[PDB]
C-alpha cells in the first residue's frame with residue numbers, strides 16, 4: 001500500500017534541531033524496518049526558527065507532498081500552534097486545490113487545522129499520531145497499541161476499528177539520549193466511558209484538538225487567527241457538521257478546568273452541539289484534570305448528545321488512529337468503533 005512516506009513540518013520546526021537528532025534517527029530506522037522509504041520534504045528539517053518564520057515554506061512542502069505521485073503517504077513531524085498561518089499560501093489562488101488528491105495524511109494536535117483544510121478540499125484524513133510523538137518512541141519498540149494502528153494504516157490505507165487499550169502511559173519527562181531504551185510509566189486503562197446518551201451512535205468523525213479549534217474563535221493566542229480562519233472559511237458549515245461525530249482531545253497545555261469550560265462554551269456558541277450525532281473525547285494527557293473534564297462535559301454538553309470519554313486518542317499514550325470522513329458506528333457497551341468505507 002505505502003512505499004514512500006513523506007515527512008512534513010507544518011507546525012513546529014523542532015525535528016531539525018540537534019537536541020532531538022537521536023530521536024529522529026531512531027524513527028527513520030523504524031520506518032525503514034517497516035518496509036518504507038522515508039523522505040523529508042525540502043524545508044522539513046530547516047529548524048525551529050526558519051519554520052516559524054516561513055509558513056510559506058511549510059505550505060510549499062505540503063503542496064509538493066500532494067503533487068508528487070511517488071509520495072504515497074504524508075506524515076506530520078509534530079504539532080505546535082501556528083499552522084493557520086499557511087492558509088493564504090494554500091488557499092488564496094487555489095494552490096492546494098490544484099494539486100490535492102486522496103493520499104494518506106496523518107497527524108494530530110495543531111494539525112487539526114490542517115485536517116480541516118483538507119476536509120474543505122474533500123480529502124479523507126487520519127488523526128492521532130505523528131513522527132516525533134509515535135514513530136520516534138524512545139523505548140526499544142514502538143508502543144504496541146500505537147504500532148497496531150500505524151501498521152494497519154501503512155498496510156491497508158485504512159483503519160477498520162478502534163478498541164480501547166489495556167493500559168495507558170504517562171508522558172516522559174526525559175527525551176534525551178539517556179532515556180533511550182527506557183519504559184514509560186504504565187497504568188491500567190478502564191476503557192470507553194459513556195457519560196450520557198445512547199451507547200450506540202453513528203456518523204463520520206471530524207475534529208481534533210480542543211485548543212486548536214478554540215483559536216478559530218478566540219484571538220488571544222494569535223490576534224489574526226479568527227480573521228484568517230473566517231476569511232478562508234476553515235470551520236465547517238453547520239449543514240456539514242449535521243450528523244457527524246465530533247472528536248475533542250486536550251493537549252500538553254493541560255487547560256485548567258475553568259478554561260476547559262470556557263472552551264466548550266465557545267464551541268457551543270457555534271451551534272455545533274445542536275447538529276452533531278455524538279461526541280468522542282480523548283483521555284487527557286497524563287490524566288491531568290480527568291475528573292474535572294468529565295464533570296465539565298456533563299455540565300455543559302447539550303443533553304441530547306451522546307458522549308464517550310476516555311478514548312486512547314490524542315495526547316495521552318498509547319495512540320489510536322481515527323479516520324476522518326468515514327462512516328463510524330460507535331458502540332460504548334461493546335467498546336468498539338467500527339468504520340465503513342463504502343457508506
Ligand SMILES: Nc1ncnc2c1ncn2[C@@H]1O[C@H](COP(=O)(O)O)[C@@H](O)[C@H]1O
Pocket residue numbers: 020023078079080108109110130132133136171175251252285315316
Ligand atoms: N522531543 C519529543 N519527543 C517525543 N515526543 C514529544 C517530544 N516533544 C513533545 N512530545 C510529545 O508529542 C506529543 C504531541 O506534541 P504536540 O504535537 O506539540 O502537541 C505530546 O504528547 C508531547 O509531549
